Amino acid sequence: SLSNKLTLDKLDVKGKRVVMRVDFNVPMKNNQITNNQRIKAAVPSIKFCLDNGAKSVVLMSHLGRPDGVPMPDKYSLEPVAVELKSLLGKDVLFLKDCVGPEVEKACANPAAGSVILLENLRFHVEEEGKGKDASGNKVKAEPAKIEAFRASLSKLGDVYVNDAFGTAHRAHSSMVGVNLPQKAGGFLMKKELNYFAKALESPERPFLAILGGAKVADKIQLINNMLDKVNEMIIGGGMAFTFLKVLNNMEIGTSLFDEEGAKIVKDLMSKAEKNGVKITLPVDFVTADKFDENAKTGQATVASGIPAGWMGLDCGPESSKKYAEAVTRAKQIVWNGPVGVFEWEAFARGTKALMDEVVKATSRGCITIIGGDKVSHVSTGGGASLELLEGKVLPGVDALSNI
Numbered sequence: 001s002l003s004n005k006l007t008l009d010k011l012d013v014k015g016k017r018v019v020m021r022v023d024f025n026v027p028m029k030n031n032q033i034t035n036n037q038r039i040k041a042a043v044p045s046i047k048f049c050l051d052n053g054a055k056s057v058v059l060m061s062h063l064g065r066p067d068g069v070p071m072p073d074k075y076s077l078e079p080v081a082v083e084l085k086s087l088l089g090k091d092v093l094f095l096k097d098c099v100g101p102e103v104e105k106a107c108a109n110p111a112a113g114s115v116i117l118l119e120n121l122r123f124h125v126e127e128e129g130k131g132k133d134a135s136g137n138k139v140k141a142e143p144a145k146i147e148a149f150r151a152s153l154s155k156l157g158d159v160y161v162n163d164a165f166g167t168a169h170r171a172h173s174s175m176v177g178v179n180l181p182q183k184a185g186g187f188l189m190k191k192e193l194n195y196f197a198k199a200l201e202s203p204e205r206p207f208l209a210i211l212g213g214a215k216v217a218d219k220i221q222l223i224n225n226m227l228d229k230v231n232e233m234i235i236g237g238g239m240a241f242t243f244l245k246v247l248n249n250m251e252i253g254t255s256l257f258d259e260e261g262a263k264i265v266k267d268l269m270s271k272a273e274k275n276g277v278k279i280t281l282p283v284d285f286v287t288a289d290k291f292d293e294n295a296k297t298g299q300a301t302v303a304s305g306i307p308a309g310w311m312g313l314d315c316g317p318e319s320s321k322k323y324a325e326a327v328t329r330a331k332q333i334v335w336n337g338p339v340g341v342f343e344w345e346a347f348a349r350g351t352k353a354l355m356d357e358v359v360k361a362t363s364r365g366c367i368t369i370i371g372g373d374k375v376s377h378v379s380t381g382g383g384a385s386l387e388l389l390e391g392k393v394l395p396g397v398d399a400l401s402n403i
Contacts, residue, residue: 001193002193002400004403005185006184006402006403007185007186008161008190010184011161011184013048013053015054015055016055016157017110017158018054018057019159019178020042020057020186021174021396022038022186023041023042023164023166024038024042024084025167026080031076032079033083036087039083040087041165043087045163045186045188046088050113055112055158056107056111056115056157058157059084059115059116059118060098060121060153061174062121062127063080063120063122067128068126068131069131069132084115092116092117094119095116095118096119099126103156107155125145126141126146126150128173129141129173146177149177150178151179154180158180159184160178160180162186163186164189165380166381167396168381169383169387170395171396181401191377192380196369196379196385196388199332204367206330206332207230207331208234209232209233209234211226211233211235213237213238213337216242216260222336224271225390226334227268228275230277232279232280233277233278233279233280234326235279235281236315237338237340239256242256242265243281244281246265247265250302250305253309253311253312254308255311280326282312282350284301284319285299285313285314286315286316286340286346286349286350287312287313288310288313288346289309293344295313300316313340314347314348314349314350315340315350316350319350320349320350323353324353324357328361331365332368332369333361335354336370336386359374
């Protein structure tokens with residue numbers, strides 16, 4: 001809901017310095033960005049600010065989980081400044097901190113039209129307002145220091161914009177603690193919330209949810225919430241083996257089994273039935289001799305069982321056909337979590353086949369929402385999308401200025 005909140009479309013930014021929380025928490029390997037979707041997604045807000053004559057746009061974000069220690073060797077945002085520069089066609093000034101005297105001076109009166117990116121907010125304990133030491137023990141943030149941190153962030157612009165939808169579930173200093181008279185929702189924040197509100201409150205029907213992941217127990221609220229809204233649900237990925245063991249006494253080898261989620265499958269299925277929700281579980285598998293990209297591979301059905309010492313790491317082809325049937329009946333699809341270990345090519349085919357069906361569904365006019373232009377909406381949300389889908393509230397939205 002953004003009808004009583006200040007949004008960027010109505011913020012006057014001409015001649016003003018804009019401090020903007022974004023979610024540049026991008027997947028990385030070897031200090032290379034392996035997906036820049038989160039960065040591209042922030043561009044329309046940035047460009048609007050620049051185009052309407054902002055003095056500067058100061059971008060701040062976290063990356064990974066350094067837990068309040070500066071870890072520039074592992075979780076620096078520097079590669080993001082590079083990437084961002086090429087997305088924008090504008091120089092981006094990268095600053096090696098996010099608070100303190102030097103950062104404040106650099107942001108005090110920048111050259112007109114400047115784009116500045118701060119280093120990882122979570123290098124400070126004060127952002128999350130808790131942290132960890134190098135022995136793993138809980139470090140407390142001092143309230144006085146949390147207040148100095150927020151006060152420093154608040155100096156870096158004249159107006160605040162939150163476009164960090166992927167972080168909106170976190171009540172962290174940069175998300176709720178910035179003290180400026182105008183705290184406005186950005187274009188991403190608005191676009192994300194709009195798609196999810198339309199999908200959840202006014203769905204096109206039949207509404208299919210595709211939920212994949214490793215464990216059942218952490219997805220109970222998610223599944224329960226979805227079962228009150230949808231007509232159909234695919235339950236895929238490794239958590240499917242918990243359902244199949246309990247519902248069909250499938251022999252699952254060494255595949256994932258959620259000893260606690262198992263005890264509540266009966267209740268999820270009962271709720272599905274009372275709601276007229278058709279549940280589609282996988283019926284066949286690509287198996288592996290070990291959890292390894294280069295494991296030896298085999299095939300199994302529910303009927304054959306998976307052999308001892310082997311684990312299912314993708315659905316197989318009959319499963320992909322049954323998933324395709326449910327996709328073909330859908331007018332709206334919300335898909336959260338892969339159906340197999342798609343990072344490894346040997347165990348990607350089910351996720352790729354499913355994507356194929358979803359893309360074909362978009363071409364037919366169906367609404368397709370996929371998680372953190374071939375589909376209706378690729379969410380940047382991640383954990384925030386899961387929290388929205390579990391009925392929960394978003395402190396990053398809540399803290400915006402009222403009109």
